[PDB]
Design a protein around this ligand. Structure first.
Ligand SMILES: *[C@@H]1O[C@H](CO)[C@@H](O[C@@H]2O[C@H](CO)[C@@H](O[C@@H]3O[C@H](CO)[C@@H](O)[C@H](O)[C@@H]3O)[C@H](O)[C@H]2NC(C)=O)[C@H](O)[C@H]1NC(C)=O
Ligand SMILES: *[C@@H]1O[C@H](CO)[C@@H](O[C@@H]2O[C@H](CO)[C@@H](O[C@@H]3O[C@H](CO)[C@@H](O)[C@H](O)[C@@H]3O)[C@H](O)[C@H]2NC(C)=O)[C@H](O)[C@H]1NC(C)=O
Ligand SMILES: *[C@@H]1O[C@H](CO)[C@@H](O[C@H]2O[C@H](CO)[C@@H](O[C@H]3O[C@H](CO)[C@@H](O)[C@H](O)[C@@H]3O)[C@H](O)[C@H]2NC(C)=O)[C@H](O)[C@H]1NC(C)=O
Ligand SMILES: *[C@@H]1O[C@H](CO[C@@H]2O[C@@H](C)[C@@H](O)[C@@H](O)[C@@H]2O)[C@@H](O[C@H]2O[C@H](CO)[C@@H](O)[C@H](O)[C@H]2NC(C)=O)[C@H](O)[C@H]1NC(C)=O
Ligand SMILES: *[C@H]1O[C@H](CO[C@@H]2O[C@@H](C)[C@@H](O)[C@@H](O)[C@@H]2O)[C@@H](O[C@@H]2O[C@H](CO)[C@@H](O)[C@H](O)[C@H]2NC(C)=O)[C@H](O)[C@H]1NC(C)=O
Ligand SMILES: *[C@@H]1O[C@H](CO)[C@@H](O[C@@H]2O[C@H](CO)[C@@H](O)[C@H](O)[C@H]2NC(C)=O)[C@H](O)[C@H]1NC(C)=O
Ligand SMILES: *[C@@H]1O[C@H](CO)[C@@H](O[C@@H]2O[C@H](CO)[C@@H](O)[C@H](O)[C@H]2NC(C)=O)[C@H](O)[C@H]1NC(C)=O
Ligand SMILES: *[C@@H]1O[C@H](CO)[C@@H](O[C@@H]2O[C@H](CO)[C@@H](O)[C@H](O)[C@H]2NC(C)=O)[C@H](O)[C@H]1NC(C)=O
Ligand SMILES: *[C@H]1O[C@H](CO)[C@@H](O[C@@H]2O[C@H](CO)[C@@H](O)[C@H](O)[C@H]2NC(C)=O)[C@H](O)[C@H]1NC(C)=O
Ligand SMILES: *[C@H]1O[C@H](CO)[C@@H](O[C@H]2O[C@H](CO)[C@@H](O)[C@H](O)[C@H]2NC(C)=O)[C@H](O)[C@H]1NC(C)=O
Ligand SMILES: *[C@@H]1O[C@H](CO[C@@H]2O[C@@H](C)[C@@H](O)[C@@H](O)[C@@H]2O)[C@@H](O)[C@H](O)[C@H]1NC(C)=O
Ligand SMILES: *[C@@H]1O[C@H](CO)[C@@H](O)[C@H](O)[C@H]1NC(C)=O
Ligand SMILES: *[C@@H]1O[C@H](CO)[C@@H](O)[C@H](O)[C@H]1NC(C)=O
Ligand SMILES: *[C@@H]1O[C@H](CO)[C@@H](O)[C@H](O)[C@H]1NC(C)=O
Ligand SMILES: CC(C)[C@H](N)C(=O)N1CCCC1
Ligand SMILES: CC(C)[C@H](N)C(=O)N1CCCC1
Ligand SMILES: [Hg+2]
Ligand SMILES: [Hg+2]
Ligand SMILES: [Hg+2]
Ligand SMILES: [Hg+2]
Lengths: 726, 728
């Protein structure tokens, strides 16, 4: 009947999920970057107008890949010469189009090679980084004010993060934050003077005669971390003769005793700012609440006004301490923190009360706080049906915590069990985004009465199209391991027959606070394997897994590469003894942390798996960056946790690879998990006389996402898997 | 009943070839290292006598990897802490043991990390290189004298070569030459200031947190080459001046006009040195003969004493200008040069007479000159039977070139057709080393009448073992293409049956002046593929191959990656016509230059090969070094030969790789054929969506000779080959 979902389909992306990306520009309108031009929509009625034609820039002379309109509506930042860097960062050329005079600004324009550009929240002000220094433009065409002069390549970063702050702590490239009305510009400074450098070769195009060596400050476990400083500058009080005067906010003293990190910065009001700090030992963090002193020009952070957040079972926050959400007057706030019982719920704070009040509770967790109004607190949780792989929008009455309403649960329970949301400026409206188990569904609503205004994108096209191909199904369920229940999912081949026996591929990640079992709808490699190759692709969340409380998550604290790997074995072990699983054909593969787990499992000696593929895996924790590693592993010193660091490497298990077919893959330009990791694995197998399969991808990074590489790695992996299974 | 030669046998070295390594200390004796006891032998009778006994260096705490006794026999240099570098260079620690008093010298020892050491050719003087500077010791226990101060890491090398000079010009690491007497010390100095650095990562042991970046000054095609200067210093003045001045010998003007290389330096007499030079365009070479001026204290090189050697069809010499061999008085010498017919023969030169006289025959070539006495001149050649893959020792009478005698041809014509030789200090005795087609045979002879004195090693031990195993055979014949014969080699499976069709693997190298078809007896991977997997392993020496004249060798001049490649394919066709080859199971593999040729063939689109393996191949000539590459390709510039440098890359044929199974292997620490080359090959196949097998070897260089790595690569290649042939 019909045809199946083939590898080509997946690689050639013949079945496209339609999206609806909007950007609210007020509490009543949003922008919708269509394909050619850009449109503005009226949330209330749905009518729209073109904001600016596509052709407006035909003879611009460059290809534009991003339009950033100032909150004014008077200017447009044009982004071109897009040269990607790490996960978030990138360099590019910029130009500003003045909408009033309908002309491109030609004087004092933004320097080529600019690292970052950001508009003030309200005006048309501009802060941008160039050569590691901050610059402010009060007017799009006027000269630029040098806010900082200490910028030095690979040494000092002003306004931007260094490799590790970008990937591990902020999860963003920018290191500057404007105050709500644009008066103040807060920023951080990173000194990487003593941070060791990671060096690897980049070959570039065939034409390059000599390979060049890329070197970037990257602290590995236990290495020397970059130090940081925080400053606040007044952007309404700068001359042009006198250099800008930035006031530094330091401490806390409890933090200054040893190494630490600047975790988060949030503006409570026009003159209050809160900064969360965390010790290198991500066990104890402090939040500071500083106020601007009018006739003093300094920022004071009164003690007693600070709040301490610590963990006795693990680390603070899922990956970092949570974002605080301040009330209108900035005198109180809400943030997600861990329960006494270890579950994540919303706590209510009083800037001067050392204790907060949980407004939500129960054995499920609040994913995130999405919107706050004097009226309600909007948030997402996996409380519905008690299934942690489901996400729904909720709103709790700030006057009566008893009046909690689920906004997405009942809209379409069959097709929707996983949501994300986007509120307008004042939360008058909100777009709901459903991504499973059925096809993605985008809808628009008004918060006054949770009226369902209209359907934005229903993927009706894709639906009609997919009903013509034998698509696989997905089963979410759980098993019980001595008391606790752990969820798992299984992509089942079309016309699945519980009577027949199918080979099984264990798709794993299992990093601390991860979830590979959910209700999201995906079109990926697994889809093809099941649809075309009739292979069952299963994923399992065991110890270390997230959104199920700290008892589960923190289970692997200071002990990576133990329970999560073992639970993965136990699971596959139970899957085989299920009847429809051919135990002679069970494989495993993972990418990144999942490459690590996969490699550790294959070298466990369980004998459960016939073959496995590891892509860009971690081989020994001392090779990964400090921030992420120390969080779960502590320091690699004999006084702390060195022993486990040494007992949890992949190479130590080399000898057990003798009983399995292993495929090791890794990009040569991986700036995240250095090629070093896989090179030490391959060398260890060679030392032990174990044969295996290998494949490197020159100049590819952790995502091995280049168009050609992508199709090539998935093609190679397919052969490997069906060769092992057939 | 009777087992075969297995991969494990090969990998574990079950069946070992015995050797007999000598070290002539005089004209009558030689030292033989018996692993625990090094004894001195008397060529005349066969005496023994321990020279340095079993337990003489215990309580040393350090293992000695090699020794080296001083010419006057009074001392012995103990080498330990060996740490390899490139093909010849290496670092090590040293200690000098005094024999005149069985004591171990502890005063003014030689520095650790010493890059190189050599005794004077007479007596007990020492000259070593440390931190790129030259040092000299008159007495082993006395403080040395520094002779150079310009030593600088990766920039200025004194007494030692840089990377390219070590691998492509001298084929030696050392760059200093004591005069025969030991009075003068000549050395070269290299300046690599402007030479680009090749850079790659070195991961080291697992305990290393951050990878290391090895960077070696290495000139790729057309890049900036190092510059050179030649100096000579008088070591007998060291104890009278304080800072002995190093006299420099420059020019020739015909060389100074552009980039050039110092090729060879050999002492003619007590105060006469000959220096060979070559332009970067390796078609013009010049030899200078300089004499010490006991009045000026300088060294002059009379122009009437200068010799020009230029080639019109290719480069000069096989891999470099020929080496000169002077007569006692240094007034005449012998060099190997190609005659007008294009064959390499020995011709006689008079230092002050521009034209030389050829003393050897015609259609075959002299491989090298081995010894020179007042009576005769000994040389090795492939004249016998007219087979270039054969090798024999001959001696020609100096007073009458019509009197030529083959000292090895007939010793054992059935078992020995490839010899190498090692004469004594005065050529009074000489050891013959037979390499095939039979088992290695080492014998000792006296020059008076050339009679065998005795057999030093007959491998009868190994012979006894190999008879109890189904060994494979070797067919060494030839084929004629375009009325000119090219020799081939075939390692046939036991009980070969011309009726039954056999799978075939083409073992290739095919580089400029090479020989893959010979008479040498080998115990390698091929012995396994034939003995056990019943696979015919063949080799073919087509255009570009050497020892058969410049007509054949220079065929691929400025055309690298052409005929050499097409011939290799034709040979496969020719082999198929023979009738005992399975057309649908023909594979091809090669390492180094063979990897390159192998890839080019795989990307040819001539559906003759099913699969192929390339170990550490060259992908595009602009990636290889200048000295080797330019010698055959000229400059990679639009004026010169750029067009072909680009027309001969492996990546330009990525597309065709869809019709063959490819396995690309390469070591990441390869300082010769950089990983970059295979990195660009993988990247190109990926760009065109062609699948292939791959394997990298962490921290392995061009040899991939690490004990464990070596086993791993051959195990990995074996699976690929038998899978491709559908055995197992
Ligand atoms: C090795 O070769 C390099 C060149 O490849 C030699 O270095 C060059 O030496 C000259 C003279 O010693 C330098 O010129 C001087 O520059 C200084 C500073 O600009 C100036 O004050 C002097 O008047 C003079 O012009 C030249 O800069 C330098 N080039 C480089 C790239 O370093 C070097 O001397 C050679 N070493 C040996 C031992 O032969
Ligand atoms: C033994 O003699 C050699 C050569 O005569 C000495 O080396 C020479 O030393 C000088 C100074 O150390 C080197 O540099 C010169 O320095 C001046 C100072 O400013 C500078 O203006 C000149 O341009 C020049 O660079 C000189 O290049 C160097 N020559 C050589 C061939 O190495 C050596 O120092 C003497 N050893 C002892 C222990 O006296
Ligand atoms: C960025 O961070 C640097 C250190 O992390 C600041 O600097 C300091 O560090 C250097 C060394 O890293 C100190 O010492 C220098 O001189 C001594 C003298 O021998 C050397 O031993 C040492 O290796 C250094 O060369 C400096 O003394 C120290 N402070 C100062 C003021 O020099 C650096 O100031 C900082 N930059 C910014 C903009 O914050
Ligand atoms: C969308 O159209 C809006 C006008 O639409 C009419 O009036 C509405 C109140 C409603 O009854 C609808 O059904 C009618 O067709 C228009 O609204 C207003 O906002 C603009 C400024 O943005 C203002 O200039 C205009 O006068 C207003 N109109 C009214 C009658 O209130 C709105 O501009 C438009 N939005 C877009 C993006 O096209
Ligand atoms: C950023 O650079 C571009 C391109 O010019 C660069 O700088 C030149 C000095 C030269 O080194 C080029 O190779 C560089 O690419 C500037 O755009 C102008 O583009 C025109 C058309 O190609 C060219 O003729 C001009 O030389 C370029 N610049 C100037 C000053 O003439 C662009 O102005 C630079 N951006 C900023 C804000 O300085
Ligand atoms: C703004 O402060 C910076 C501080 O560095 C000044 O810039 C430097 O000034 C010194 C003079 O002491 C110069 O030698 C440097 O070349 C300048 N550049 C840099 C990047 O350091 C600058 O002069 C100050 N501006 C004013 C108006 O005071
Ligand atoms: C943005 O907020 C700032 C800070 O609250 C406002 O600036 C202050 O304005 C008051 C009077 O309204 C002055 O007395 C202070 O001196 C200002 N503070 C500073 C540090 O300059 C500003 O008015 C707000 N902007 C708008 C448009 O309301
Ligand atoms: C946070 O973790 C640290 C250790 O990483 C705990 O402090 C002590 O650290 C030393 C050295 O590693 C250990 O020997 C102790 O067992 C740790 N605890 C104590 C009580 O000394 C620290 O206790 C942790 N913080 C919290 C709040 O649990
Ligand atoms: C061998 O070395 C030299 C090579 O000529 C011999 O010659 C002497 O060289 C020095 C210069 O270093 C001159 O001053 C002498 O005049 C040369 N000697 C004669 C006899 O002319 C040297 O004599 C020999 N040395 C040894 C140890 O044999
Ligand atoms: C050696 O080869 C070079 C090639 O580099 C020849 O040099 C150039 O000049 C010649 C004139 O004498 C031309 O005829 C060559 O074509 C030219 N070669 C190139 C590539 O530019 C040189 O002639 C040769 N020398 C001898 C003795 O044959
Ligand atoms: C070897 O023996 C020499 C003497 O050998 C004897 O005399 C000679 C003339 C022959 O007749 C021989 O057969 C006799 O055995 C010694 O002079 C010499 O030093 C010895 N050399 C060694 C290395 O032991
Ligand atoms: C309980 O389950 C955990 C998680 O799988 C497992 O590690 C353990 O062996 C079981 N028993 C005990 C006593 O922990
Ligand atoms: C070489 O090193 C050893 C120990 O590392 C030391 O004992 C010896 O003295 C050193 N030699 C010199 C000349 O410094
Ligand atoms: C004829 O020429 C050569 C010999 O010079 C021979 O090897 C080749 O096969 C023939 N020509 C071609 C185009 O191959
Ligand atoms: C998952 C993400 C937060 C993380 N920084 C990461 O890149 N991982 C790569 C494998 C080990 C850590
Ligand atoms: C063969 C040798 C003289 C040479 N240096 C070499 O390493 N080759 C490697 C393949 C291309 C050149
Ligand atoms: Hg943090
Ligand atoms: Hg998470
Ligand atoms: Hg040379
Ligand atoms: Hg040769």
């Amino acid at each position: 009947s019909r045809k199946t979902y083939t590898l080509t389909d997946y690689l050639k992306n013949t079945y496209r999920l339609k999206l609806y990306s909007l950007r609210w520009i007020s509490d009543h309108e949003y922008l919708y970057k269509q394909e050619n031009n850009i449109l503005v929509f009226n949330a209330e009625y749905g009518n729209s107008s073109v904001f600016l034609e596509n052709s407006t820039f035909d003879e611009f002379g460059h290809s534009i890949n991003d339009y950033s309109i100032s909150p004014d509506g008077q200017f447009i930042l044009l982004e071109y010469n897009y040269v990607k860097q790490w996960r978030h960062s990138y360099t590019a050329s910029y130009d500003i189009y003045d909408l009033n005079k309908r002309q491109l600004i030609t004087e004092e324009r933004i320097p080529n090679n600019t690292q970052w550009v950001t508009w003030s929240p309200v005006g048309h002000k501009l802060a941008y980084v160039w050569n590691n220094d901050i610059y402010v433009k009060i007017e799009p065409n006027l000269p630029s004010y040098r806010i900082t002069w200490t910028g030095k390549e690979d040494i000092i970063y002003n306004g931007i993060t260094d490799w590790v702050y970008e990937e591990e702590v902020f999860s963003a490239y920018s290191a500057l934050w404007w105050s709500p009305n644009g008066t103040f510009l807060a920023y951080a400074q990173f000194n990487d003077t003593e941070v060791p450098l990671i060096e690897y070769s980049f070959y570039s195009d065939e034409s390059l005669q000599y390979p060049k060596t890329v070197r970037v400050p990257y602290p590995k476990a236990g290495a020397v971390n970059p130090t940081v400083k925080f400053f606040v500058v007044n952007t309404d009080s700068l001359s042009s003769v006198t250099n800008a005067t930035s006031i530094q906010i330091t401490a806390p003293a409890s933090m200054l005793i040893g190494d630490h990190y600047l975790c988060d910065v949030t503006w409570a009001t026009q003159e209050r700012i809160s900064l969360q700090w965390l010790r290198r030992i991500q066990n104890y963090s402090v939040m500071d609440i500083c106020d601007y002193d009018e006739s003093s020009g300094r920022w004071n952070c009164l003690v007693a006004r600070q709040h301490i957040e610590m963990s006795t079972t693990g680390w603070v926050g899922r990956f970092r301490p949570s974002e605080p959400h301040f009330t209108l007057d900035g005198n109180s706030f809400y943030k997600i923190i861990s329960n006494e019982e270890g579950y994540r719920h919303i706590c209510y704070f009083q800037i001067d009360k050392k204790d907060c009040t949980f407004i939500t509770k129960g054995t499920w967790e609040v994913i995130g706080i999405e919107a706050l109004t004097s009226d309600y607190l909007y948030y997402i949780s996996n409380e519905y049906k008690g299934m942690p792989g489901g996400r729904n929008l909720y709103k709790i009455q700030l006057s009566d915590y008893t009046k909690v309403t689920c906004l997405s649960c009942e809209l379409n329970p069959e097709r929707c069990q996983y949501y994300s949301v986007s509120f307008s400026k004042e939360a008058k409206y909100y777009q709901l985004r459903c991504s499973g188990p059925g096809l993605p569904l985008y809808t628009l609503h008004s918060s006054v009465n949770d009226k369902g205004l209209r359907v934005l994108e229903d993927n009706s096209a894709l639906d009609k199209m997919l009903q013509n191909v034998q698509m696989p199904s997905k089963k979410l369920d759980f098993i019980i391991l001595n008391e606790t229940k752990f969820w798992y999912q299984m992509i089942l081949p079309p016309h699945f027959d519980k009577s027949k026996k199918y080979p099984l591929l264990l798709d794993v990640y299992a990093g601390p606070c991860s979830q590979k079992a959910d209700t999201v709808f995906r079109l990926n490699w697994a889809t093809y394997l099941a649809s075309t190759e009739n292979i069952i692709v299963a994923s399992f969340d065991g110890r270390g897994s997230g959104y199920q409380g700290d008892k589960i998550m923190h289970a692997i604290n200071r002990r990576l590469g133990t329970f999560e790997v073992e639970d993965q074995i136990e699971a596959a072990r139970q899957f085989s003894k299920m009847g429809f699983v051919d135990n002679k054909r069970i494989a495993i593969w993972g990418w990144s942390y999942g490459g690590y787990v996969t490699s550790m499992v294959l070298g466990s000696g369980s004998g459960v798996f016939k073959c496995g593929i590891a892509v860009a895996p971690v081989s020994r924790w001392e090779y990964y960056d400090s921030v992420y590693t120390e969080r779960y592993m502590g320091l690699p010193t004999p006084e702390d946790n060195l022993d486990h660091y040494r007992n949890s490497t992949v190479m130590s298990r080399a000898e057990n690879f003798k009983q399995v077919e292993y495929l090791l893959i890794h990009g040569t330009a991986d700036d995240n998990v250095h090629f070093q990791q896989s090179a030490q694995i391959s060398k260890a197998l060679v030392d032990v006389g174990v044969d295996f399969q290998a494949m490197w991808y020159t100049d590819e990074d952790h995502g091995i996402a280049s168009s050609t590489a992508h199709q090539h790695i998935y093609t190679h992996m397919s052969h490997f898997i069906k060769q092992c299974f057939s």
